[model samples]
Target chain A: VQIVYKPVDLSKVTSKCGSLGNIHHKPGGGQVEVKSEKLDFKDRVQSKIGSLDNITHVPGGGNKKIETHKLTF
Target chain B: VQIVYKPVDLSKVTSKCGSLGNIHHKPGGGQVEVKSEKLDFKDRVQSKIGSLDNITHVPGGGNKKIETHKLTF
Candidate 1:
């Protein structure tokens, strides 16, 4: 259960374990960007979910940025 | 602090730098799968601290897929 046949280019994906980001969508979708820096994830959703408020930088990535979505294929 | 006493296979854990899989645990654990495509993340609601959605179509993977849960161990 980890098969994406193609539809992920949310502009440079990254996640070393946990810090921030969770832009959800799909099903009349329109939103993308999911990241976490500590591996504490949960699951399941029907059609409405949203979130993407993150900010982390300090020797993992210079000027690390996470807040971009808009890819439909 | 990253030593699991057995119980962690969260469907191939992955994180390059930012995405929140903050699946909150301990205090009697049970719950897995945490992947953040951005190395950034959060949430303390402890339920929809759930977002089994991801994809690694590149940073070099092939294609992509997100929306999977039950890496039950």
Candidate 2:
């Protein structure tokens, strides 16, 4: 078990446009944003818990700002 | 997705005496403590993401102080 002494702050997550921000689903089946180009994570299920969603641009940026959507359950 | 803007502290989890406080398993194979008498959670999988483990007693209490073990991904 992990020991946590202080309460968690839940406001540092980015939630504009296509960001996952600081959200976590309790029953799973939630989405989160990840940098796929560096992690080699394809648009598929990860560890049977989370699945990657569609790729969204970074608003002003082009395909280079592609983000992978992740759903966890 | 939800948005949170603070950091989480990781030191308040109780690790001794069969306690699963303040801990979460990333891959969905970790344990945590729960009050069973108040909740109807049995020794089963919760929402396909977590499961309840064995029952343990409080360090300074008896079986009446039983605690349910919970595992999450």
Candidate 3:
């Protein structure tokens, strides 16, 4: 799995998920944060079977597709 | 090649190479450090490449024409 980052200027940042609610909205650097119920998915979740919104800003700059390197076992 | 890294926002950094000097310096995280006469030119001084300013931040923060990922052989 890969982690996504948005490396855009905070001032230049605009959001697609604003009022438009459409899939293809061209915003500069937009984002959202979510708090979940529990992070138990890391243990019981088998290979490729879990998820977490481990939102990272350092790596996730205004990337359209490519993110950072993945650490696999 | 040596890898460089700069993570912004030591809390909303601001600067400009400023106006009178006129670098068009829209400085969010402006930086400068000078240590004189320490590094060798790597190759023979005859071929002469890169006097080493070593200036930068990250990619996608602006239209500042920055791109990452370089591995040389």
> Largest DockQ belongs to which candidate?
1
lDDT of 2 at B47: 29
Q: Which ten residues in a row have the lowest lDDT in candidate 1 chain B?
A: B55-64
Query: Candidate 1 has what TM-score?
Result: 0.13
* TM-score, every prediction: 0.13, 0.12, 0.13
Better of 1 and 2 by lDDT: 1
Ten contiguous residues minimizing lDDT sum, candidate 2 chain B: B57-66
Computed on C-alphas against the true complex, the DockQ of each candidate is: 0.07, 0.03, 0.02
- Local accuracy of candidate 2 as per-residue lDDT tens digits, B1-73: 3332234533221211322233222322234222222233234332212322212211211112122222222
Error of 3 at A39 (Å): 67
**Where does candidate 1 stray beyond 4 Å?**
A1-20, A29-73, B1-15, B22-73
Off by over 4 Å in 3: A1-16, A21-73, B1-67
Q: Judge candidate 3 at residue A41 and give its lDDT.
A: 27
Strongest candidate by lDDT: 1
On residues B11-51, what C-alpha lDDT tens digit does candidate 1 reach at each position?
33234455333232112122334354442224334333323
